[PDB]
Amino acid sequence: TXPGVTXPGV
Amino acid sequence: XAXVXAXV
DNA sequence: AGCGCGT
DNA sequence: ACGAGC
Ligand SMILES: *C(=O)c1cnc2ccccc2n1
Ligand SMILES: *C(=O)c1cnc2ccccc2n1
Ligand SMILES: [Cl-]
Ligand SMILES: [Mg+2]
């Protein structure tokens, strides 16, 4: 997640 | 990700 | 496949 | 002294 707790996703 | 001081 | 930090 | 999260 996040990148950040990427995205979800990417 | 660990939060030992930032917890990010 | 895809990445961030401060007490 | 530290790795979490669809
Ligand atoms: C969480 O596992 C984690 C790992 N490495 C990092 C590097 C830089 C900033 C934040 C980070 N968070
Ligand atoms: C929190 O601000 C912080 C800063 N530096 C660290 C280095 C190593 C482990 C934990 C840390 N936490
Ligand atoms: Cl990114
Ligand atoms: Mg990027």
Side-chain angles (χ1 to χ4, degrees):
Chain A
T1 66
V5 306
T6 77
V10 193
Chain B
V4 288
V8 245

